[PDB]
Each structure stands twice: as C-alpha cells, then as structure tokens.
Amino acid sequence: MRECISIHVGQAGVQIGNACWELYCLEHGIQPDGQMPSDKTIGGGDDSFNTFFSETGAGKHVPRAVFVDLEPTVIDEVRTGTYRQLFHPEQLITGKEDAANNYARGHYTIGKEIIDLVLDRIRKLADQCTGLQGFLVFHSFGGGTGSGFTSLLMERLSVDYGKKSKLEFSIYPAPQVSTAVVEPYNSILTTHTTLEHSDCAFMVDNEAIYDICRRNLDIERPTYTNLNRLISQIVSSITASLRFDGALNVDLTEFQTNLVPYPRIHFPLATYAPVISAEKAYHEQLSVAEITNACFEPANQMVKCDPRHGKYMACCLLYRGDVVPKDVNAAIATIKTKRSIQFVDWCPTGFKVGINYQPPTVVPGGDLAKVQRAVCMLSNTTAIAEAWARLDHKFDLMYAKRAFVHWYVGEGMEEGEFSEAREDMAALEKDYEEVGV
Amino acid sequence: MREIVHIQAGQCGNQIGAKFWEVISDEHGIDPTGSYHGDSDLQLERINVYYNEATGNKYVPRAILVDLEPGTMDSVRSGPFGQIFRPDNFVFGQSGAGNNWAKGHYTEGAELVDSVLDVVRKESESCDCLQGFQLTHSLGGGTGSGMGTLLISKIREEYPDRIMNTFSVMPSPKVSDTVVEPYNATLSVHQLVENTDETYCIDNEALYDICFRTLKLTTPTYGDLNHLVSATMSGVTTCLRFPGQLNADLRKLAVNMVPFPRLHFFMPGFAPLTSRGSLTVPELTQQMFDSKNMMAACDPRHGRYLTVAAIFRGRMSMKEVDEQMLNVQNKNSSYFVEWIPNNVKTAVCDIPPRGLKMSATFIGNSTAIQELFKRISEQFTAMFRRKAFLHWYTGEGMDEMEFTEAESNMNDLVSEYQQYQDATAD
Amino acid sequence: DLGKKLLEAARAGQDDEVRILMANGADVNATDASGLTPLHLAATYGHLEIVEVLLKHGADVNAIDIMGSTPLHLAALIGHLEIVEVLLKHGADVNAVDTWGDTPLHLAAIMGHLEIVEVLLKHGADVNAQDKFGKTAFDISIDNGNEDLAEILQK
Numbered sequence A: 001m002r003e004c005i006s007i008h009v010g011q012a013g014v015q016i017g018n019a020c021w022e023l024y025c026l027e028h029g030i031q032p033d034g035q036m037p038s039d040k041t042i043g044g045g046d047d048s049f050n051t052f053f054s055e056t057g058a059g060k061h062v063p064r065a066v067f068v069d070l071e072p073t074v075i076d077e078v079r080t081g082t083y084r085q086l087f088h089p090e091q092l093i094t095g096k097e098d099a100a101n102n103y104a105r106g107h108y109t110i111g112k113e114i115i116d117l118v119l120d121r122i123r124k125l126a127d128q129c130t131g132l133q134g135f136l137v138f139h140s141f142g143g144g145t146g147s148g149f150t151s152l153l154m155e156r157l158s159v160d161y162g163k164k165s166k167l168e169f170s171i172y173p174a175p176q177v178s179t180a181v182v183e184p185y186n187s188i189l190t191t192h193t194t195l196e197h198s199d200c201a202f203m204v205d206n207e208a209i210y211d212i213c214r215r216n217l218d219i220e221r222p223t224y225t226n227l228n229r230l231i232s233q234i235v236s237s238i239t240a241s242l243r244f245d246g247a248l249n250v251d252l253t254e255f256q257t258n259l260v261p262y263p264r265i266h267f268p269l270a271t272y273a274p275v276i277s278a279e280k281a282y283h284e285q286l287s288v289a290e291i292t293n294a295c296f297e298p299a300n301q302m303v304k305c306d307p308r309h310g311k312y313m314a315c316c317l318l319y320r321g322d323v324v325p326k327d328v329n330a331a332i333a334t335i336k337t338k339r340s341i342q343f344v345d346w347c348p349t350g351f352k353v354g355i356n357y358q359p360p361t362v363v364p365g366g367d368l369a370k371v372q373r374a375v376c377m378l379s380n381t382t383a384i385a386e387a388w389a390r391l392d393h394k395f396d397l398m399y400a401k402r403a404f405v406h407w408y409v410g411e412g413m414e415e416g417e418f419s420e421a422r423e424d425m426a427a428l429e430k431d432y433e434e435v436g437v
Numbered sequence B: 001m002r003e004i005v006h007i008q009a010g011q012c013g014n015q016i017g018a019k020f021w022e023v024i025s026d027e028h029g030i031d032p033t034g035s036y037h038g039d040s041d042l043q044l045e046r047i048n049v050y051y052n053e054a055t056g057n058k059y060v061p062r063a064i065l066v067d068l069e070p071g072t073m074d075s076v077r078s079g080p081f082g083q084i085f086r087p088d089n090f091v092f093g094q095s096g097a098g099n100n101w102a103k104g105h106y107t108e109g110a111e112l113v114d115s116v117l118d119v120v121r122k123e124s125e126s127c128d129c130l131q132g133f134q135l136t137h138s139l140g141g142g143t144g145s146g147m148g149t150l151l152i153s154k155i156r157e158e159y160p161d162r163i164m165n166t167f168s169v170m171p172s173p174k175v176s177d178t179v180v181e182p183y184n185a186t187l188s189v190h191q192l193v194e195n196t197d198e199t200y201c202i203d204n205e206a207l208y209d210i211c212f213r214t215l216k217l218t219t220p221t222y223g224d225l226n227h228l229v230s231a232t233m234s235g236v237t238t239c240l241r242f243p244g245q246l247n248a249d250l251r252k253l254a255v256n257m258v259p260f261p262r263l264h265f266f267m268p269g270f271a272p273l274t275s276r277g278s279l280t281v282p283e284l285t286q287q288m289f290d291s292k293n294m295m296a297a298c299d300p301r302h303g304r305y306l307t308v309a310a311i312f313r314g315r316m317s318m319k320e321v322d323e324q325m326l327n328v329q330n331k332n333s334s335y336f337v338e339w340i341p342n343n344v345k346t347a348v349c350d351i352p353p354r355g356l357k358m359s360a361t362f363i364g365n366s367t368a369i370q371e372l373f374k375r376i377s378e379q380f381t382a383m384f385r386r387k388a389f390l391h392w393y394t395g396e397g398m399d400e401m402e403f404t405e406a407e408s409n410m411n412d413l414v415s416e417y418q419q420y421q422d423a424t425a426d
Numbered sequence C: 001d002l003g004k005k006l007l008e009a010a011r012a013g014q015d016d017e018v019r020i021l022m023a024n025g026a027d028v029n030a031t032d033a034s035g036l037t038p039l040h041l042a043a044t045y046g047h048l049e050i051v052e053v054l055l056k057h058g059a060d061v062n063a064i065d066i067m068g069s070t071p072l073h074l075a076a077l078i079g080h081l082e083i084v085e086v087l088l089k090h091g092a093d094v095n096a097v098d099t100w101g102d103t104p105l106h107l108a109a110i111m112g113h114l115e116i117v118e119v120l121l122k123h124g125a126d127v128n129a130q131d132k133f134g135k136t137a138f139d140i141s142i143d144n145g146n147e148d149l150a151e152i153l154q155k
C-alpha cells in the first residue's frame, strides 16, 4: 500500500474530479458521509483502496484529494453538493479573481498569490502518508488556471517531492464546447513548461468525448455533465489498478515502465468500450472479442487520431467484469494479424493484460447502461502526434500576426516565451517522427 | 469579478444612462422605488453587479451622475427613475461646456474632476469584488467628451488593473449640425484609444438612418434614437446581469474580443428592429449580420470580422442556434479573418427583454469600423484646414499640436484596421 | 489702424461699431495676417447683418485669403444658409476653388449641410469638380455612404 494524492485545478479539473470521486465511492462502497460498512479495520488499514482514501478514528473515509481554483464559484458547488461531507473542508482552496483565460495570469501574477497555501495544504496530506508514491493532476489545457497555475504547481512539486511520480489528466480543447479564443496559446505554453516535470499524461480530447456522446449515447447537444460522466468512467478504468488487487500497473512507477519508452513521449492514448445508452437497457452483451476489437476503432478513442497511421510502442489491456483469460488470448491472436497493427522494431511486440473480475459501476442519473464486461486499452502510438499538429497549427495562425499576445506580456510574461514554447513543440512532433509514422 | 460602477457624463450620457437603468431595472423586477416585484429567482442572481443592497430589501443602482450643466439635474431627477439614484451621487456644475471639449477637459471640467473621484472612491470602497467601470457619454459635446475622457484617465490611474468600459455615442450632422463636433469627437477618440479596454460605438448617423429609412421616422427624436440604444445596452450586458454560459466577466470578454490593444472599438447590432409602441432563429442570425441592423454606420461586407460575440435571448432551440450560426460563418467565410480560428462565440440567455420573446445582440470587432473613423476624420480635416474656431480651443490652454497629434493618431488607427483587413494567412 | 478694429468688429458681430468705423474711412477690404477680410469673418461667424452692409460698401465678395478661401467657401463650410444666398445674390463665384481643390460644393457635402448643397446646385455648382485627390461632390457621397447626399446630387 502506497498513497496517491489527486490534485484538481480550475473548473475543468474540479468538475471532473467531483464526478470521479463520486464514482470511486460507488465502486468501493463508500457512503457520501464517508462511512464504509464493509471496512472491518476502523481507524486505518493497508488495503488497496487506502491509496486513495485515508481513515479517521471514527470510521470516516476521506479522499486524498485537493481542489484549487482562482475563483470560488465551481468549488462552492462542491461544498454544497451531495458529497459535501466527504472532503476535508481545508482541501477546497479558492481565490477571488481567476486567470481570465490567460496563461500568464495563472502562472505569474494571480497564481503567485495562492501557490504557497496550496503547497502547505498538500504538504499536510503528505505528512499523513507512510509511503507516498506521487500525484494525479486534473486540469484543462485551455483555461488560464488549468494551464498557468498548473505549470507553476508542477514546477513546485518537482522541488519539494523530487522522487515522487506525477501523472496528468489533461483536457484538450475542442471548439464545440470551448471557452476562449486563446486556448491554443495556453495549451502550448503549459505543455512546454510542464513537459519535463510530468512522468505520464493522459490527454482527453473534448471533441472525442463530445462525438462519442452524440453517436453512442444519442445525445443531441452534450453538456459538461454528460462529458464528465464518461470521462469519470474512463479515468476510473485507468486508476482501477491502483485501487484494487491486480498484477498490471499496480503502482505509479509501473505506468512509466509499460507505457513511456522515453521521457518526452509520455502521452498514451486511451480507448474504451463499450459505450451503450441507458435507454438500451436490454442490449445484447458484447463478447470479449467484440469489445477487444472495438479498442482499435478510432471512433472509441479518447483523443481523435488514426492509430493506423503511426506505430505502436506499448499496449496495455485493462478488462473489468466477466472475462475469461483464454478468451482474451484468442481475441489478441486474431486481431494481431487480422489488422494492420504495426509495432516499432525496437519494442517487444506484445500486449500486457490485467483482468478485474468485477463489472463496471454506473452512477444513478448517468447516460451509460450496465455491461457485463468492459475494457480500457492504454497505448503509446506515434499517431497522437496528430493532436499536437492540430494545436500547433492553430497556435501558428494567431502568433504570426501576434494576435492576443499583448494580454500575455502585460501580465509578467515575456514575449520570448512564446517562441521557445513553439520550438519545444516542433521538437516534440519530430520526436514522434524519429520513432516512425 | 462582480461589482461594476456606472458613470454617466453630460446631457447625452445621462439621457441614455437613465434609460439604461429604466430598462434593465424593469428586467430585474425593480420598481421605481427599488423594491423587487419580480416573480423569478433568476432576476436576483447577478443583481449585485449593477445594484447595491441598502437595507429594506432594496437596491440602489451603483451609478454616478455628472454634468457641468445644472439643467440635467432636473431632467434625470424628474424622470420616472430619478429618485432611485443616490442624492450623494449627483455631481453637477454651475457652468456648461458649450460644445467646447477644452472647457470640459482642461478648465471647467478639470476643477470638477476631484469631486467626481470622491463619489467614485465611495462606491469602490464599498465593493466586495469590484471588476471595472462603464461610462456613457457622447463624443461631440464638451462635457461627456472632454471631461469624460479626463475622468477616464484619472480613474485608470487609481484603478490601473480594473476594466474601463465605455458606451460612446458618435456625432453625426444628421442629428446635430454643429461643425465643432468633429473636433471634440477626434480629440476624444485620441484619448479612448489609450485609456479604455472596451468601447461600444453607438453612431448617431446609424441611429438616424434606422429610424428614418427603416423605422419610418421622418423626424426622428432623441427618444427614438435612445430606444435603439437602450435595447442595445441591455443586450450587450445580458450575460453580466443573468445566469448563463457566457460567464459574467468583463476581463474575459476583453481577452477574447480584443486581439490588438488599440482595436477595442466594438460595432454593436440588434435584431429585430422595433419602434416605441409597435421571426425565428434563422432570421435573428441572418438579420444580426445585416448592415441595417448595426448601431454604427458601416457595412460589415466592406471589411473582415476579427472577433464576434452573439447574445441570443429567449426560449429557443439551442441546437438550432449552433446550426444556423455555423451556417452564416461558412456562407460568409470571406468576411472573417482566417488567422483567428473559432473567432465567433455564441451563447443563449433565458429571460428575453420586455415586449420581445426572442432577440439577438451582435458585438463585433470588425475592420469595417474604419469607415466610421474615416467619416469623422474627413470632417475634422475640412475644419482644421481652415482653422475654423481654433481660438475657441487654444483660448483655454490647448496647443495646436493636440489637434494634429489627434488627427495623426486616428489616421494611424484607420491604417491599422486596413492592415489586418488585407492581412492573409492564405 | 481702423482696418484692425473693423476685423474684430466684424468677427464679434458689432453692427453699430462696423457702421461707425466705415464712416471714418475704415478699409472695408482690409485683411489680417492670413488674408481674411472683414467679409470672410462676417461669413464665418454667421453675422448676416454685417455681411449685407459690407457688400453695400465695396467689399470684394470674391476675395481669397492666403489659402484661397473665398467668403463663400467659409459660409458653405460653417453652414450659414442665409449668408450663402446673400453672397450668391452678389456675384460670389459658386465654383471658386481653393488650394486643396475644394469648391463650395465640396465643403457643404463633407459637413452634411444638405440645404446648402441644394442651393449651390440650383446656382450652377459644378458636380464634376475634383479636388487634389480626384474626389468630386458625388464621390464624397459614395465613399461616406451618405444616401441623402447622393440622392440630392443625382436629382
């Protein structure tokens, strides 16, 4: 048992964090007041769910989570929602004035006024740990706080916790539900500055989750509720191995070993199946081979791209529910050859498999139907360079005219930081191209 | 970002500022005395943005009234909402300005600026989360233009990080044939280019053409023009006064609408056009981008859109708004700058304005606005070349170089709009 | 010099003083440093009575200043319709051109004095007169989108 601390920054990270922790409580059997009847060891324990929940003397299970935002509106919804009594009151930290969708306001001017308090409160959660292994950080790419404060936080975390792992859940901006025109600028600025301080980052493309909601769930105009319900279901599948017994990705270090061959290319792609509307409650159950096959279909990816284009450097299959091991090996065998799936010449052309024999949990009020078996594939493919090529293009268009740049310079930032960030990006795209495509 | 401080200067500033409080207060269910007679809890969400709670479950508008002419005191005071304002928020002089930008900015109005800052500090000190300021005035007169810009500069010195927002009415000979107004307008534009973050250009030439040629008003009156104004000030401020997705943040609007600091002059538009006693989503969207529905006398088809905001109001299909909006951008892609991706922002609001069930407000940063500035610059140049009435201004201390520097500063502004209208990403 | 007091007298609209100085031999056609006669100033500040009296006492209705402005240029610019007609009644050249190539029609169109436009046209104002930049009264109407002006110039 080694503890993980989850940090949620800005509206995007906070709202998605609220949905995840709700789901965490349902999968583990924790009541919104924090009571876990099925926990015979009151006041403490070495169980696998204790990596995410601490315990009080009175039998309260409190998430090891911290919520930070530069305005209080979104966090106020967390202090008055259902699970208001679950979180530490002092782990919900809010400012007064937000970063105005401005990376510089979140990193230099505004963010600078709360970064010390954020660290102290984090440091309080760490002192309660007997073997902290690292942090999970939820933030948006396009918000001023999600980008600017988060880069600043990551920098501070490498100083005070140099040996601990830092994983990322990042929201990739999509125009169908965007907020700011400068979101490409903030995306590039935070990537470049967080790149050397992040061990592994799972990007969530709002456009991918949006389309999935419209096609599979027949939702005409998906909102942030619908989007986050599905993200929380996928996040749950990535962090399940850390919260349950298992033999694949049991600790944060193992995320890097299996998915990140080289430090800079730490952007694995996540694919999940099946997604079925709760209106089809009597659906026919998909087979282990059916859901497995769907993990190589671009339409189910958490980031829009075409893995047919690139090469695979690592693949992990995390199954949940009624899944017989021999049925997975048979599914792999055929799909290995029945499709143009190309690994790099320098990697063991294999698949890692872990099975959790409990079906996924669904939350009351959600858009998904219950399923007997599901799978989340985590893969590192050079095809996710396509996502970067889309960001960098939108960046280049505006920066060529220097559009919106004065807003950044007037808030402590220096104009040279734009160019070196864009070069760093240009290098990242050639990192994937030197691997193959 | 919450409280905003309203300031109205001069006859036009108070004349359109008063109507603003009459319109929005009716939307928030605030009777003339200040009591909330509304039947919806949404009418009180973002109420503190424009009002104060002064006990008794009442709301005193956070407004400051100024004018060198004491006559404006009676007009506003004797209005249907003249008593809901603070008696302490009345700063009025004994001497007018007489269409002299100099008297308002250098002599008369200057002596009256310190007192105005007093009532401004009184309001800000009592603000729990002050975000910025908004000033209504004309640019042709002497008080609102000459003194209003001086007060803008003073406030910005004390509140340098707050947002300064202005509703500036542009002079037109169609409504007031005074030959010294191009002077005042040009001298003011010189100030507004430096010391404000967002400026709504409300053009008397466009207001007159809408009433005369569209509203069928052979002899339009300041009441007819102000009706179109009041409705526009309510639409552009809808998201600051009611819940919705377009957050409620003057600074996030300025971050997304102003790509270059000097290009912060917005062309408003409103649809449908209505009179004073007197259509689906496709019409609203289409009509919004029609030259006849613009509050500034310029044809958007003559230039390119840098950024655009659209505020829809009323019960309406939300997916239908995303479809039709997406359509006009494609059919009119030649009129948007390609080097600013996703430069169009949309949002709906539930509560529409009185008399209407579904409206739309258009706020555009468009290079075609240079036409408005070309008009004023021509008239300024005609008068300056003859030195007509320059002694009215130099007699108050101004140096002749202020006219030239002001005239050069505006020609540069025009050159700047033209530069990004022909700028291509391919 | 009575020429100097007649310039101020006309500028400030002192009718009684204008009459007095003329009885003592004041130069009705004196000019200031820039070439402005009393008739220029009377036409600028809209002193209709001083304009009619000067014209009855030898004032040159077509005098120009150093910049080429005739009294009718300044009256058309400033927007004094009564004075425009009086000056036209006395042989003022409706198509006089100044050093910017502007005629009386140009200034009236720019400043929006639509009444004065119709009077100049009715007295022979040349609609094909271009300025130093090739603009004519109609061109100014098209470039500024003034529909009222354009219809009047088309008639």
Ligand SMILES: Nc1nc2c(ncn2[C@@H]2O[C@H](COP(=O)(O)OP(=O)(O)OP(=O)(O)O)[C@@H](O)[C@H]2O)c(=O)[nH]1
Binding pocket: A009, A010, A011, A012, A013, A015, A016, A069, A070, A098, A099, A100, A101, A102, A140, A141, A142, A143, A144, A145, A146, A147, A171, A172, A173, A174, A177, A178, A179, A180, A183, A206, A224, A227, A228, A231
């Ligand atoms: N999936 C998802 N995306 C969100 C959510 N909230 C915001 N976003 C996305 O995040 C981006 C906007 O960033 P925000 O998280 O709202 O900004 P922020 O971190 O609060 O920073 P500031 O508000 O500017 O101080 C846009 O791309 C949104 O689509 C959410 O609840 N779910």
Ligand SMILES: Nc1nc2c(ncn2[C@@H]2O[C@H](COP(=O)(O)OP(=O)(O)O)[C@@H](O)[C@H]2O)c(=O)[nH]1
Binding pocket: B009, B010, B011, B012, B013, B015, B016, B069, B097, B098, B099, B104, B137, B138, B139, B140, B141, B142, B143, B144, B145, B169, B170, B171, B172, B175, B176, B181, B204, B207, B222, B223, B225, B226, B229
């Ligand atoms: N739209 C509108 N414009 C006005 C109104 N009153 C005056 N104006 C314009 O404002 C200009 C005169 O400036 P004014 O405000 O009266 O001078 P001030 O007293 O020094 O501020 C003229 O060009 C008028 O056309 C009004 O009620 N509505």
Ligand SMILES: COc1ccc(/N=N/c2cc(OC)c(OC)c(OC)c2)cc1O
Binding pocket: A178, A179, A180, A181, B236, B237, B239, B240, B246, B247, B248, B249, B250, B252, B253, B256, B257, B307, B308, B309, B311, B342, B343, B344, B345, B363
């Ligand atoms: C070019 O793309 C964009 C253009 C405008 C955008 N936002 N605009 C607003 C407009 C507002 O009121 C009019 C707000 O109310 C004060 C407002 O507060 C949040 C934002 C957003 C864009 O991503």
Ligand SMILES: [Ca+2]
Binding pocket: A039, A040, A041, A042, A043, A044, A045, A046, A055
């Ligand atoms: Ca226990």
Ligand SMILES: [Mg+2]
Binding pocket: A010, A011, A071, A098, A143, A145
């Ligand atoms: Mg925010």
